[PDB]
Design a protein around this ligand. Structure first.
Ligand SMILES: [K+]
Ligand SMILES: [K+]
Ligand SMILES: [Zn+2]
Ligand SMILES: [Zn+2]
Lengths: 189, 191
């Protein structure tokens, strides 16, 4: 397995995967996988149509985060300002991407604006986890901020890592694999 | 299904859904759904990891388009400038939500820039008419809905919505968005 050690180290240097991930992906003894994490300075050892939206802030920038409740898959974007126009545009992209039937926000004046109500009307979305998810997202951003000049890039690096490089559960899937399985199954029924 | 006729007709004013989608979505006989389209003045009756990318232009603005070859699924955005930075950011966003293993593109200034190559290396993507046909259909759909939006930005996402969700066909009567989810889900089962 000695060849896999350099591969796992490059994997962790980009995505900061945990030791179970590296042990399984690169056929490493757990003792070796844990040493990669311990050596790293940045680390230590529902219905399918429901989404949650919230705005969080980092480095004086607004990050719009959507979470597929049933899977944990997230989409996020740095927006120029916390406005309903930016939220409506965001919802319209998401809605053409996945089956978005219901969206849960706080009563933020961006989520209650008429521009957003107009967007949900057009896209056929009803309006009516995310906090624990902003925490996890900001954690990943911190691990990778050094790899990006601008925050917007780090944010998208973090989303990539959460959806694809953070596996778990009975199936051992990532959140990206889960949402695809959940929606694909919902089609068949 | 007689009550569904007014609902489908109302939705077609908005999405301009093809007849297969209205028949499926509203439980209308094909012959009824076909009439709705005929009445409309604006209408008329490989590995899962492979994507194509190109820029197309409309109203003096730049639209970056990504096509999932195996399914016909599309993502598209109006970008502020044909630059490697904006293309790389688009690339990083796409790879976070789908399995992007290979991206076919032109050898132009933008898609061969070092910034785009940096994004591909970080995300595990390797670089290497379908895009032309999707460009003309997307531009065609944007034409049908352009009056519903102030800015081209919104009309583009409306067109992407319509193309992925409201244009069904084939054996299962799937949309392009249902086909990509089905194709990727099947790839997971095999792997
Ligand atoms: K450590
Ligand atoms: K017609
Ligand atoms: Zn680390
Ligand atoms: Zn029409």
């Amino acid at each position: 397995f000695l060849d896999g050690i350099d591969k796992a180290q490059e994997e962790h240097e980009k995505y900061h995967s945990n030791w179970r991930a590296m042990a399984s992906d690169f056929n490493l003894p757990p003792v070796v996988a844990k040493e990669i994490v311990a050596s790293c300075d940045k680390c230590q050892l529902c219905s399918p149509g429901i989404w949650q939206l919230d705005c969080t802030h980092l480095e004086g920038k607004v990050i719009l985060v959507a979470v597929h409740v049933a899977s944990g898959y997230i989409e996020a974007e740095v927006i120029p300002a916390e406005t309903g126009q930016e939220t409506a545009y965001f919802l319209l992209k998401l809605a053409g991407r996945w089956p978005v039937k219901t969206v849960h926000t706080d009563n933020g004046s961006n989520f209650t604006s008429t521009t957003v109500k107009a967007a949900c009307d057009w896209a056929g979305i009803k309006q009516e986890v995310i906090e624990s998810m902003n925490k996890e997202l900001k954690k990943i951003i911190g691990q990778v901020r050094d790899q990006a000049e601008h925050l917007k890039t780090a944010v998208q690096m973090a989303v990539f890592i959460h959806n694809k490089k953070r596996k778990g559960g009975i199936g051992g899937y990532s959140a990206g694999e889960r949402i695809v399985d959940i929606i694909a199954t919902d089609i068949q029924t």
